Amino acid sequence: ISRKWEKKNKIVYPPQLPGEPRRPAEIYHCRRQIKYSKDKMWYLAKLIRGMSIDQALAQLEFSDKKGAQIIKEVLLEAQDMAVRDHNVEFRSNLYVAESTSGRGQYLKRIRYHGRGRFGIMEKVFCHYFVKLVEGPPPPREAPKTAVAHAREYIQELRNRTITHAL
Amino acid sequence: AKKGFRAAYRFQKELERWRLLRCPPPPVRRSEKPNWDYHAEIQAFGHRLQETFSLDLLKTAFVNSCYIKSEEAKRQKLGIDKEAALLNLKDNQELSEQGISFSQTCLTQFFEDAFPDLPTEGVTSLVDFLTSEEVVCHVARNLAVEQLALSAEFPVPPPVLRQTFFAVIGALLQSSGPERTALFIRDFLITQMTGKELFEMWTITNPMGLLVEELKKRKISAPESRLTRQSGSTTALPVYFVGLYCDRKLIAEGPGETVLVAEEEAARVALRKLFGFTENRRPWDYSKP
Amino acid sequence: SEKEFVEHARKAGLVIPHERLERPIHLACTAGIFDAYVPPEGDARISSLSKEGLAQRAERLKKNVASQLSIRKIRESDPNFKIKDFPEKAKDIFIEAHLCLNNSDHDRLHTLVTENCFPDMVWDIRYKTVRWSFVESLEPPQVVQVRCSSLMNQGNIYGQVTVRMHTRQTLAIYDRFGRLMYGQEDVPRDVLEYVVFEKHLVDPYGSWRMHGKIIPPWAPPKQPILKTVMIPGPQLKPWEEFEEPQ
Amino acid sequence: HGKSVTWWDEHLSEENVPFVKQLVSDENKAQLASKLCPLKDEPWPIHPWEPGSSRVGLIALKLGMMPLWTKDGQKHVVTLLQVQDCHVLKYTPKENHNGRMAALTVGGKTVSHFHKSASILEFYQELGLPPKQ
Amino acid sequence: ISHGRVFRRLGLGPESRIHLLQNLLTGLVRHERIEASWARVDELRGYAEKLIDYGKLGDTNERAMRMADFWLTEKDLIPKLFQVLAPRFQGQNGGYTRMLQIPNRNEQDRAKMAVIEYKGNCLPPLPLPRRDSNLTLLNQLLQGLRQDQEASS
Amino acid sequence: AAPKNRRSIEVNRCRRRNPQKLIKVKNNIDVCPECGHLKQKHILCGYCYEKVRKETAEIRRQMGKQEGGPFRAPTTETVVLYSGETPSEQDQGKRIIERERKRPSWFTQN
Amino acid sequence: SQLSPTELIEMQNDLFNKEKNRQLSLTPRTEKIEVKHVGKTDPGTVFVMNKNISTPYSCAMHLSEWYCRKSILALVDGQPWDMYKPLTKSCEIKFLTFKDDDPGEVNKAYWRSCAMMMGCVIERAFKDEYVVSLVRAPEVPVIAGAFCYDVVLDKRLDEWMPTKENLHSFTKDARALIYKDLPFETLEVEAKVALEIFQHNKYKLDFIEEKASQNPERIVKLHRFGDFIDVSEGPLIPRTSICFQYEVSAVHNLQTQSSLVRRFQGLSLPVHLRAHFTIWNKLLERSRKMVTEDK
Amino acid sequence: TARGTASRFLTSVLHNGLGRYVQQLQRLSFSLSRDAPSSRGAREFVEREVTDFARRNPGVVIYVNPRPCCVPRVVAEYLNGAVREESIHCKSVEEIAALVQKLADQSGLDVIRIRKPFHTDSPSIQGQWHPFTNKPTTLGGLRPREVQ
Ligand SMILES: [Mg+2]
């Protein structure tokens, strides 16, 4: 096994020279060897990306997936870690930087079939990773306006060259 | 397990490579690296440029204020006695001033002689450009001046490098005549003007006005913008060719997306013909008189 | 098809193997401070007066029976011992220990400070950055009292010396992201600390160490934090109604 | 911004709901009975009948079916179609639509205001009818 | 094709459905408030409304009695229907029942849940949804319109 | 019928990261004016409904103590009371449940 | 005094910044005040805050984003506080919402804010050649079908009343104002340095004089958003973004003996309360009628 | 392969050979073993050739390090900043000489595919074709069906 994500919270930065912009907090946290599947977990973890932490808690609160409550618990833990251990005012000020599902170590079992054949079955486990960053949520990108597409096209026609030409 | 040193060692090399790929090390002076002899370096500089310097004057030329103040930090923090031998160092300030003054004079003369029709504002703009931060730093760093320069903060911020380059010029001006140094300048500076435009380095914002003034000076009257060629007006990509006429003769002409853009172009073209900064123009002379 | 996981870690305190220890735990120090000197309540207004403070301090030192009984036990067990030299050494121990917290060097910090002190001064601060400087000592370090604990089991004696000291210090604590947390680096702030020292006597290697730090009940409220802090009300289950005291 | 979903009813008190309903229904009565007199308003010029001509249609409502008899004795079955509120809504000229025949847009029975869209409600607002299904 | 089918299929068949609603009804008449599968509660609500109208028909009506006999399973309840429930609904024609959606069941089957109730029961009141007050900004803007529908009449 | 070739990871990402298989964001969530927890707008508040549920259970327990057996249910209406209360003239002639707790804030006297 | 339109803006903003930095300098340290929470929701909660720095908005942030978005006004003790107005002493706090049971306080605030917005929209919507004097924002009850702002205009402009085009332009500009989200900022000032801000508007100086007259310490209440500053009675809503539906309904010329004053009426609703298209049209129709309460 | 690797246009460093020619190779560092056989050629080269090489090229500084290594290398280093590594391991004197020459005459630019064999600033003297260059102009400059 490999446990890295945990140690990401043990990093110490050099103090900030005055006049430099204030560095936003980062909190890495995870839960290992959950009895959920990795994929079913992925949908959930995907849902809450880039949401402000309260928004994610609200969304998870009402989902019916078994994983919803796991993730929620991990988020509360991470929030309290962020205010207690790292120094963060305004526990509402976190947004979800990274949310993802890794695969755990699987158990292996028999699945009985008929005519004495068998399949080989896997009791599945998974990991849930999260990384919380201090600040408002970064703005969701608007699709390209007609103006943007037109500029790009024009710029392209203008990048043309006489080819194999000299 | 597999028994051998070889693959293990060879892999140690891969490990080091990845280590350097994920965290690049901050750039280090060539002087603090394994093979260095400052003296031999200096001599080689001179020989490779095909010039002859006084080694005292060059060694002087690569010295800077900052190197001396940092050396005084190391002097004062350890309680050492330096002052006589350290303040004997004779920095490059003087040399750099002679260098820049002479180079600006030289250049100005070169252009003034080559482009008789360039307005003084123009030739000024040109000398300004070839003496710029960008150009001089590029050339200096490619001649291994950054290598030899004595300075704090290894990337050697651009003002220090301009200082040091022209320091070397001045050192050359003492070491050899203004003739020799004029040749060096026309070889390592003027060549950066290759491929470049006029209005690439001049930056003037109203071509039409400037054209009208220059034509007052030439005793020609009223450039009239007259539309020559066009394709599609209703398109999202039109092309206009605007001509400029003086007494119904055509002086110059240009393309554009919009009739305004194109008119402005025809102005720039006309300007470029008048001033004799042109594509067809005689390429520069590199020769030994 | 049959394999299971292993490694569910647990901590089980159980008195039986704890008793069966064949080499009983050897302590360099004792966790408590036997007798805590409780200082004058006007000790702020007698500090600006030199020969008031000095007089009453030296007086209370010479006048006390317990004080000179313990000083006699230390002098008789440990020759070439002097009380008039000691606040110098103590003040030096201080300055080195805290300059150890700056650099975060724990090895030297285990020679200087005691086993009871180390958890305290190191623990919370290990993921942060500390910058601590010594600028002035306003009133030269005073020796308030001396005490001895006689363990009849070991025949072991621990000399405990309380040095009251008044100081000028600059403390800045930075957060693990390098952003300032506690206090400025430019303010030479004035402190008053009652610093307990300890030494093992029967021990041949006989280190003088910094045992503990006593804060008086009237001590000036420490400078305020930078960040805002919230204190939640009692967490309520559904059927439990809230009750407000006045 | 996470702006929440909302319907017409949501923020009204128990007091104001009957009020709003009255408001809407009453203005529906007014509006329908106002356009009740077509010929005295500004009728578009009436033309006589040309041979290849074609009339406007209707939007009706299927009621049910009924038997009906003919004088020869035979039985028929018929469908009742009730016309409820039927108005011509807009007019697209001949050259703007098929290049052959003009287009009249006819509305069907009245529906609630609250469950249509801003666009459509604007279209009827400038007309002065209530929304058609 | 399901067109105009009023009753939903539950249980092991039509009969099993009736017996399901039997138990639910009995439960409702005894405890006066129960919670079940939103669909089953919805299905029940009709019968729970009509039972009260058979109770209104009186003890002496035979039809109402063998009706309440079949539907109320624990026979002890049959008096309570006639002598408690049916009397306390007199004025109101249809208003007997309140049915609300509860949050989804906390068990892993995560069902859709409803609470169903006989009005005027003696229990802590459900946290019903309240309409907005009249003091609310938008409603205050409507009150203006109202008072000008009075002033212009 | 057996798959003729392994499906590539690109294809499979296309299938399962499709918008239609993604969890869709619920926009009807709000706060309960009472306890300040979360609820969907068309559904009762879970928390408040839990208070009510507990109290209901207690009342039913104590009205199970008044009934000596399974089949005895009163032929009269009932009323529930709390510490420091007495049956009104309108409320007398009814089954009385007496509870120890003080009458809850949400629960009115009626 | 010879001054451009932009110079007035510059002077006023620089004065405001001077004053704000003076109030900042008045507080030497980071002082800790203990706020308590009297709200129906999370009782016993205690915030430990920075005196004259921390605001009731910065207070909500310790709870959850939910307060942050839902809370328009902050009741401190018995008084309404603007969400960004820094807390002075230790106290108790309750938060106030649009869908709350006795919203009246909030309603008032909302109305005021909208009025002020319109004011801005008006002052900058006229040609430099003319002279636009904002008068005041008369405080109407909200049962009155609109909110309004009093404005006097250049004498040569006295003959025209606007066209639906112009009104719709005002509206477009107000919506332009909403789109970019500007916090409403508050400052408490002494009349001496208050009058120096406004100057050229006479009516403003009169208003300031009365407003300061009824208060013992000569305190005037200033609000500002973006580059626009105005004096007003009572607190305002925290953000510009709070408004969703907004209209400048119609104007009405009303004349004293000594002045000719135009009254601009407009109507708006917050995102929280937003009303259906039909409902909106009816309210909009009532908002066209003259609304008179000055007393 | 060409789609596989990077590429560059044909260039000179600092317009070399325009004004004057500057030998681009700056310094040369040898590392060899006095003892080990692998370095044999490299030793002979250092004996006979290096000296003469150093006279033939005044502008390059040559650092020779005897050290205990198994694999003799030569590190060429250029004005360009470019550093090119080579192994003289187990070669003749002749081979090494040829190699050191290649190093001497290289530009220090990266060796990759070169997109085209020529490089011109201002290829275009006397014009550059555009759709109108060969078209005749008409009277009034009217379009095809335009009337006046
Ligand atoms: Mg078998």
Ligand SMILES: [Mg+2]
């Ligand atoms: Mg398989």
Ligand SMILES: [Mg+2]
């Ligand atoms: Mg498998």
Ligand SMILES: [Mg+2]
């Ligand atoms: Mg079934």
Ligand SMILES: [Zn+2]
């Ligand atoms: Zn609730």
